[model samples]
Target chain A: PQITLWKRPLVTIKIGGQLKEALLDTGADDTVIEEMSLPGRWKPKMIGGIGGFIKVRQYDQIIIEIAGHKAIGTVLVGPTPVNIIGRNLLTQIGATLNF
Target chain B: PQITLWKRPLVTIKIGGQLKEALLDTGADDTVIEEMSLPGRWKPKMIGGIGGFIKVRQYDQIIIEIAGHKAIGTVLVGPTPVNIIGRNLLTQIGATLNF
Candidate 1:
């Protein structure tokens, strides 16, 4: 499916058996979600973005379902204004930027 | 052209008579560029993102050429890690997200 750029490319995602909406962020290198509790051991990490750097908990091998597509990769939980689905997972789902 | 998610969708752009590279950000609502001098009067504005809000100068009716395609819209200038070509301009160039 092709989504227009008239609005943010947001889609529903299932993570930790919970449903949530996340932005498909081509500018972000890694997936970062708002602070959430997940059953797993995570490491404290700091990541930088448009604004600055933020400390987050890096959870690896997490399976996430994005708009009916499943992907497993590293997910960073932090104080982000919005949930972001970056290239790490976008590539797994064969997402692309087309013009 | 279709760009895979394996790499950041960075593209060359021409703005203010200068050529530069920018990321095609589907998650960003507005186009924001690194600090630069554009001939015109701009308003002070604040925008929020992954980390936090930042103050920027907003210039309207700015013409920018992205990957040889031209778009005119509002452009913000501030201390950004990289230049971002957001939906405001992406839509003008008929860019879309496909899977």
Candidate 2:
């Protein structure tokens, strides 16, 4: 059997009172947060990591509306240069990419 | 004058013990963290939003090495359907998008 990958439409996200566009990638299993893009005032905690232990924190759960679908879940926080749309949210909404 | 947008290479990021790739968008002025992408241990505090007051938190600064270049900054944490790469880090590293 041949395996085929699906491509989904990118959506715009509101962060720090701004709307930023991002692609939806189902190949990724975990949700990610870019540390540099975060607004000041919120402080995250440190946790254990694969190499050792890393610090992270949690934030409010925002409602994501895409293609008339929505899913809610807590995310893992860290500082990154960019943002990503992972599979956790994609699978929950029963998303299937259509060419 | 017509405004032309530049496209940059997408870089991979590690979060919650996972590797995910994301694009760098310079149009975004602030750093953002999806609340959903955060791990459970990292407790975040809430802050005010455009609508009103909201809860949020922070995380550890992960050094992002991309395209033989590295930049470090703090990211905001929030629960969302996807992760976002904002302009805050993009400009600091003097990133120029190549179509």
Candidate 3:
């Protein structure tokens, strides 16, 4: 399936058994989600973006379902304007950039 | 051409008559480049991201050559860690997300 960038390339993602909208971000190296409490041991880390750096909780070995496709990887929980599905999970779902 | 996410999808872009590498970011709505001097009348703007918001100079009607493909749009210059080619420019180059 191919998705055009006429609009925000956002898709329904199921994570922590909850549904949310996330953008497939090729610019991001890691997946970042809005503030959500997940049951697991997480580490306090900082990630930099267009603005600056922010503190986030890094949850490892988490499972996420992107558009019904299941993938397991690290998920960072922090304060973000929107949820972003980065390359870490994008590769798992076999996502690619086409022109 | 289809690009896999095995590595960072960085492409060479010719902007301001200078070549620089930038990431194709579908998650970003506007294109943001690193700090550079461009001759134009720009307005001061602020943009938010995974971390927070940052002030930027918005220059409109900018011509950027992305991987030999030409695109024209508004470009933002700010203190970004890396150059990001966002949807504003990606759409002009017919970039899409595929799985």
Candidate 4:
């Protein structure tokens, strides 16, 4: 499928049976989701981005559906201002960068 | 050209006749570079991402070459921990997100 950067690159993703839009963030090292009631034993973690740092819970082995492509990976749920689809999930989908 | 996201997506970029490796940061709204003496009048600005915010100098109409493809866009110089190629330059290079 083809995608253009005319605007922010966003895609629908299904996590924990809930659907939401997430930014395709190739810049981030890990995938992060806004606060959610995810059931799992997650470790407390901190993630830093361009701005500062945020507290998060790293849930291992979460299944996320990206553009219908399903993959199992880590999902960090926390005070993330925006849901981000980072390299963790992008790798599972075999995403590529083209110029 | 095709790029694999096996690790952080990085590429060689030429900015102001100097070559450097920068992360292909799809998650960012603007391209940011480490502080350097740029020959131009720039304005002070601020950028916020997942973490928090950072003060930057916005230099407009800077020419950057990525993978041999030349593009002119807004470049931000600041105390960034990493050099990132954000949407501003990616769009000019006709880069796409694919899986």
Question: Number of the top candidate by TM-score?
Answer: 1
* Per-prediction interface RMSD in Å: 0.8, 15.2, 0.9, 1.2
Worst 10 residues of 2 chain A by lDDT: A1-10
DockQ of each: 0.89, 0.02, 0.87, 0.80
RMSD of each: 0.7, 16.2, 1.0, 1.1
Candidate 1 segments exceeding 4 Å error: none
Q: Model 4, A25-50: lDDT tens per residue? A: 78888999999999879999988777
Sorting all predicted structures by DockQ, with the top scorer first, yields 1, 3, 4, 2
Candidate 3 C-alpha lDDT tens digits along A26-53: 9899999999878888999999887678
Q: What is the lDDT of residue B83 in candidate 1?
A: 96
lDDT (10s digit) by residue, model 2, range A49-95: 11233455554464454334565654545743334455556555554
lDDT for model 4: 0.88
lDDT of 3 at B81: 89
Candidate 2 off by > 4 Å: A1-99, B1-10, B15-17, B35-55, B97-99
Predicted complex 3: CAPRI docking category: high
lDDT score, candidate 4, position A87:
89
B1-99 per-residue lDDT for model 4 (tens digits) = 877777888889999889998998778889999888888779999988777789999999998998788999999999888899999889999999877
Model 1: per-residue Cα lDDT over B1-99, one tens digit each: 999978888999999999999999999999999989899989999988877888999999999999999999999999888999999999999999997
lDDT score, candidate 2, position A87: 56
Instruction: Judge the docking of candidate 1 as incorrect, acceptable, medium or high.
Output: high
**Ten-residue stretch with the least lDDT total in model 1 chain B:** B46-55
| lDDT for each candidate structure | 0.93, 0.45, 0.91, 0.88
